[PDB]
Chains A and B, each alone.
Chain A
């Protein structure tokens, strides 16, 4: 007997036992965790000769099970969480350790931002969201010691506790780190058998998209635990569900007190979820039921789907099919081939638009900013620290210099949507030269010489030099950002403003009826097209791009400028991407025809 607990604790354990045996999915989840760790242990104990312990409980069911247990948890959680955890360890031990819970909700009008937190909400269960800054370092915490004795040869043992334990209180008893037992003998300690459990604390500010007009922000701080270390990098957007504990003696202990108001507050646990934002953080968690992949397989084998998905990104924009084809070929992105003992070769596609004003060149990039995943938009400026980190760190614990990522490091595997590309000064264009082929960013400022990684994809939309004169004088510097910047870009779409009468009609009823295939299927098509499967190139497609490339040199070197081997490499990239679209494995002549036609319309 610990303290031979009361029949109240028996009442809570029996009732929650009845609920957990009422709905029977959770038993199957426990069975899945237990079998998976079992067979992993069989692989690690049989050939050569991980998953945590928590069950996600939703608060849907308890509202239709018991009002008492429902409104019991959301008011006083230090009386209702340790019984339910005790019964769940009873079930998991009986079917074949902590076994914590989650409480995914649906929360009870406790959806509050940390502006309105304190203080009559104290010691309840509260859900908080916001930005994460300024995440500290990971340190291990000690729980159990083990000592070897000399010379009698008996191990020993000791426990340790704290105030950030299970959620009740306890009359504290400190305990010296032992040495020289009775009778007097040296106790040489040991490691490897003495346990350790990790520990980390992060602080949370309220959202800037939700904040007031201009005021100072106000923030709280969260302690994490064993299986929650290192989920959220600083800069994310994070939902936290926990218990708003208030520990410490607030200066009422000793008289003539300083630290005028004590009772410092924090949040324990419990279930940090990262969530999707508009501009930072992955959204690849989107579900794929078997109905959905069965429908993808149903539409997967047609012969017009490139012309269906061409006209899918334009629900309300007239014309410009070939731009849409280029944007889908960007979102598929090609394949990445890293060599053995050399340098890798680049996979994606880079697109520049240029043309007259009022041509929906800025309306398009917001649409690519919505449908894709990890889009980051930079307009104008810029300096300092888009392509770099600027290294401004003043770490308080010790003299050390960290890095704070800009816009180029953070958008990895993503899309960067730059507007007004001519307004950039050349000093940042040095950094764009460093990104767009070298695929690395070397920073050796004060400092620490590093070489991190960033392999983004770039879309820009620049204005002409003077007027709308896109065809009048010559193509030779209507753009005027020479010359390597013209060569790094794959495609150069040149958009004009022709005047007609039929074009005025077709624009007219489109714009008029707009004031009065579907995309959340289309991105589920996209990610399944991306992870499976990479194609290989075959013999049927070499000679088309070889003959086509010698054609483009021997004649387009008589028409226009410039042509490098980078054109050949982008031919291979668009061939691979159009092979990815049809969910195939090999490469056909059809792909070389389509990419050939796109490069014809792009250049000529």
Chain B
């Protein structure tokens, strides 16, 4: 119609793009036979649910067709400009061809399979009945097919699907090889002129909610006519309906009445979260913003709170404005749909493959002297203190927990303090190791309140209700919780830490909580001595503001002295000035291991569980008789530290079991336990000079 709602032409065609997308779907040989008959046959064999259609095979197909002749119609930019029509267009391009019968149905499979099977079979018999009727009423056969295909109501192919479909953006590598769709943007950068494209962000996830079902189509029954009246729901709120809308309970006097059912609808998981700004890509005087994300389908349960993530998705509107008196029409309030999630700091132990990984791991293993090299590698940009780095590698490894069938549980973990002041560069190690380990939270002294690092209760928006929002310690479990300035903590926080020293437990009896939440954390602390520093006139624990019970809960305690000495100063000055002169320290003859390959090594190392033996029983027992024997013949408040509790015995077996894993051997030997006794006797007792 002209003159009201007029027309426009544009260069974009939807005619040959469908044909080209069919040709791409069939003939692609690069990755036995073709690529998508294998994966799509795997889908129809009912062992898979998602389909990843990348944006690299399309571009390589365009350079191949561009060099063969003829000219190929530009399709990649056509996806990148619109990116919403192509899921439905692409998916009805898939459904013409599918290798159906490749395996008979199992009996015990599922319920969604058997529902879609009965819909398909009933659809066939309905389609064959009418051509068994009209064909016997005469009076090439394409015409009779066109007769039957338009006098029969069917289940539409939007409902018999079983899978989902997800894109995947293109690298800088493939765009560099042949010469945009994924430039990593920030949340300030998203102008309001990207609505519809396919973009990429990065930030820290905060406040990820629960997973609860949301409806897509609703299936009623009519009870008299016998139909099944569907209804699609697009909006936030819907409304139920009344008497009927069929073609038999309509045009009659006596309409029926319909009521719903839940084993014939179609559900989908649903979960929303928020991205905060990364706080490194901000201007000078500003505050981090936020931007919502919906998540549908298979991609759910991959957004853990407190991470660094690279979400790529398309960017739609969703209608709302705020107060009614502020509206000007037709303000829209955007969100970000999710398509494919790629994390930095990949989390152990969510990996299985080993074959390609050994090409990098076996280089470190065949490099020779793996252990002291890795001990050199953690935070190389300081000088000195090889023993502290040596112990903190054993913090990052950890292990091994043990259930004894009661079931009372033992740890399983190491707890390390640091002492001395001020210029021994202790904060650099805390930022360092709370940057190497995934799931690592760095909290200062004050700082967090008592309710900041325990959980709290708050009302939840749209999904309901009353979830316990976690604190710092509940966030970082099975990780490392660095702590600055341990002396300035409020005393309630001290009892919280002492409750973490017994395993698993924080207990709350406040105004709305009776729970016992879990925490499997590891604690590294850094306490300062009494003012000013290190008087050998003053006794131990005189210059320490902490009770010796808390000294007993730490199996490993350190102290970093500060004594002026002539010889080390030139090495230290050449070290530091050698890096302000440049940006890399080590030379002659060493290279630092990159941290990603190191996390691959340590992440590989935690799947061993070594087993002790009988000679190490004798050696551990006799060494404990030594330490117990000489530790209690002093009994004074002197530089000696009494009284070598059996937590040192459990801690030294636990350090032996930790050192045995880096040999990757299940071969607990005497160099193991001898190394552990070396770190015990050298660990403390450094205050002699």
Contact = CB atoms under 8 A, between A and B. Distances in A.
Contacts of A542: 573-574, 577, 581
B456 interface: yes
SS class, residues of chain B in contact with chain A? loop
A405 to B, nearest CB: 7
A435 to B, nearest CB: 11
A566 B562 CA distance: 13
A412 B615 CA distance: 62
B459 interface: yes
A569 B1 contact: no
B276 to A, nearest CB: 7
Contacts of B368: none
A146 B332 contact: no
Contacts of A141: 328, 330-332
B179 A191 contact: no
Of A193, A337, A398, most buried by chain B (CB within 10 Å of CB) is: A193
A444 B485 CA distance: 16
Contact of B444 (A49, A442, A453): A442
Given A140-B195, A191-B82, A453-B282, A437 B427 contact: yes
B672 interface: no
B330 A427 contact: no
Given A48-B179, A157-B7, A449-B475, A397 B322 contact: yes
Given A196-B192, A452-B279, A139 B331 contact: yes
Given A196-B193, A339-B381, A155 B443 contact: no
A182 interface: yes
Contacts of A193: 10, 82, 196
B330 A142 contact: yes
B196 A191 contact: yes
B14 interface: yes
Interface in B1-18: 1, 5-10, 14-15
A191 B316 contact: yes
A157 B3 CA distance: 11
Nearest to B462: A398
Contacts of B443: 442, 444
B648 to A, nearest CB: 31
Interface stretch (B61-69, B208-216, B284-292, B538-546): B284-292
Interface string B408-449: 000000000000011101011001100000000111111111
Nearest to B576: A568
Given A139-B321, A182-B1, A438-B427, A430 B488 contact: yes
Of B82, B85, B423, B580, most buried by chain A (CB within 10 Å of CB) is: B580
A450 B569 CA distance: 38
Interface stretch (B98-106, B134-142, B526-534): B526-534
Nearest to A549: B573
B461 A537 contact: no
SS class, residues of chain A in contact with chain B? loop
Nearest to A338: B583
B452 A410 contact: no
B570 interface: yes
Contacts of A188: 85
Interface in B432-490: 432, 441-449, 451-453, 456, 459, 461, 471-472, 475, 484-485, 488
A62 interface: no
Contacts of B488: 430
B597 to A, nearest CB: 13
A448 B203 CA distance: 14
A433 interface: yes
B195 A191 contact: yes
A557 B564 contact: yes
Contacts of B316: 191
Interface in B314-339: 316-317, 321-323, 326, 328-334
A472 interface: no
A565 B451 contact: no
B531 A483 contact: yes
B197 interface: yes
B572 interface: yes
Contact of B428 (A343, A427, A537): A343
B6 A156 contact: yes
A209 to B, nearest CB: 21
B298 interface: no
B22 interface: no
A163 interface: yes
Interface string B1-44: 10001111110001100000000000000000000000000000
A283 to B, nearest CB: 14
Contacts of B177: none
A139 B573 contact: no
A572 B580 contact: yes
A343 B317 CA distance: 40
Contacts of A160: 329-330
A92 interface: no
Interface string A338-350: 0111110100000
B180 interface: yes
B87 interface: no
Contacts of A115: none
A427 B449 CA distance: 13
B125 interface: no
B84 interface: yes
B574 A553 contact: no
Contact of B196 (A192, A452, A550): A192
A155 B580 contact: no
A138 interface: yes
B81 interface: yes
Interface string B265-291: 000000000001001101011111000
Contacts of A566: 423
Given A141-B331, A233-B286, A399-B461, A337 B580 contact: yes
B176 to A, nearest CB: 11
Contacts of B332: 139-142, 196
Contacts of A276: none
B559 to A, nearest CB: 17
Contact of A342 (B1, B381, B531, B572): B381
Nearest to A561: B532
A562 B534 CA distance: 13
Interface string B567-608: 001101110110111011000000000010000000000000
A568 B573 contact: yes
B626 interface: no
Interface in A434-477: 434, 437-438, 442, 444-453
B196 A153 contact: no
A155 B581 contact: no
Nearest to A152: B7
A453 B448 CA distance: 17
Nearest to A447: B452
Contacts of B471: 444
B446 A430 contact: yes
Nearest to B532: A483
A434 B180 CA distance: 40
Contact of A487 (B5, B423, B447, B472): B423
B681 interface: no
8 contacts: A141-B332, A154-B9, A156-B6, A192-B82, A396-B323, A397-B323, A413-B284, A437-B427
Interface of B: 1, 5-10, 14-15, 81-85, 179-180, 191-193, 195-197, 206, 276, 279-280, 282, 284-288, 306, 316-317, 321-323, 326, 328-334, 379, 381, 421-423, 425, 427-428, 431-432, 441-449, 451-453, 456, 459, 461, 471-472, 475, 484-485, 488, 528, 531-533, 562, 564, 566, 569-570, 572-574, 576-577, 579-581, 583-584, 595
The 10 nearest A-B residue pairs measured at CB: A191-B196, A192-B196, A564-B423, A140-B192, A483-B532, A198-B192, A482-B531, A397-B322, A444-B448, A412-B284
Given A181-B1, A550-B570, A553-B569, 15 more contacts: A139-B331, A141-B332, A155-B7, A162-B328, A178-B5, A191-B84, A192-B83, A194-B196, A339-B579, A342-B379, A410-B285, A444-B452, A445-B452, A449-B475, A565-B576
